[PDB]
């Protein structure tokens, strides 16, 4: 795989699902080996784990005081488009949630991909590893390609559901919108989060009903979105990942721990 970047600067803007505030984005190409990094207040924040500052209802990165919330979306889009050198300038405190999915980012950056002349340093899983936490469990093991699976035990008519994402099936998860349960919203709000969550940017469900009149675009949109958010957090390794992964009720917290463990036991 050769390093990939954008042939021209692109721009994105919209309200953040948690901040409920308007935020703008400007992606400018970079030089080979530059890497994936954000640019805020004149401070470059590389897309690495060591830059993770808060992992809750979304993966956030921050440094020197600067803070960016919900970066797993854009990061996941780059993981599927295999981009390695680009600077995402962020205007605000959270990455615009757009419609709750990554279909827009994927299509816009997809129609502007530029191949470079340098092999990418894929992070390949050389040995198996597993992390656990309150029932949450994530197992990673070597694989000839990137394969992320997610299983989840829901409390509403969703019951238990699971889906496997293999290289070349992004078009089946990028359309996965974010999702929350009516009982969870109360918490997402009391904790000062989801201030921008709406039926137009979030999949609200109940004990036995789907609040969003549009219904689910798939029979497993929820777990599919978990695979999307896990694919983004998985980029926190500093380079595209190669291997297979199975997540059970995993959450952004575990996603980061797993990566941290992988980069800690793998090193360079
Ligand atoms: C998948 C996860 O891991 C993570 N998603 C999130 O954290 C996440 C999901 C959903 C939301 C939301 C929301 C929301 C929707 C609608 C309303 C308006 N009404 C309020 C009361 O009546 C019904 C609706 C208010 C709020 C917020 C956050 C992720 O996708 N991360 O990438
Ligand atoms: Zn998400």
Curated annotation (Swiss-Prot):
Disulfide bonds: none annotated. Changing residue 221 to N: Loss of activity. GO terms for biological process: lipid A biosynthetic process. It is an enzyme of class 3 (hydrolase). The active site is at residue 252. It catalyses: a UDP-3-O-[(3R)-3-hydroxyacyl]-N-acetyl-alpha-D-glucosamine + H2O = a UDP-3-O-[(3R)-3-hydroxyacyl]-alpha-D-glucosamine + acetate. GO terms for molecular function: metal ion binding; UDP-3-O-acyl-N-acetylglucosamine deacetylase activity. Pathway: Glycolipid biosynthesis; lipid IV(A) biosynthesis; lipid IV(A) from (3R)-3-hydroxytetradecanoyl-[acyl-carrier-protein] and UDP-N-acetyl-alpha-D-glucosamine: step 2/6. One of its GO terms (cellular component) is membrane. The keyword Translocase does not apply. Its EC number is 3.5.1.108. The keyword Ribonucleoprotein does not apply. Zn(2+) binds at residues 73, 225, 229. Its cofactor is Zn(2+). It holds the Pfam family LpxC. Belongs to the LpxC family. Catalyzes the hydrolysis of UDP-3-O-myristoyl-N-acetylglucosamine to form UDP-3-O-myristoylglucosamine and acetate, the committed step in lipid A biosynthesis. PANTHER family: UDP-3-O-ACYL-N-ACETYLGLUCOSAMINE DEACETYLASE 1, MITOCHONDRIAL-RELATED. This is UDP-3-O-acyl-N-acetylglucosamine deacetylase.
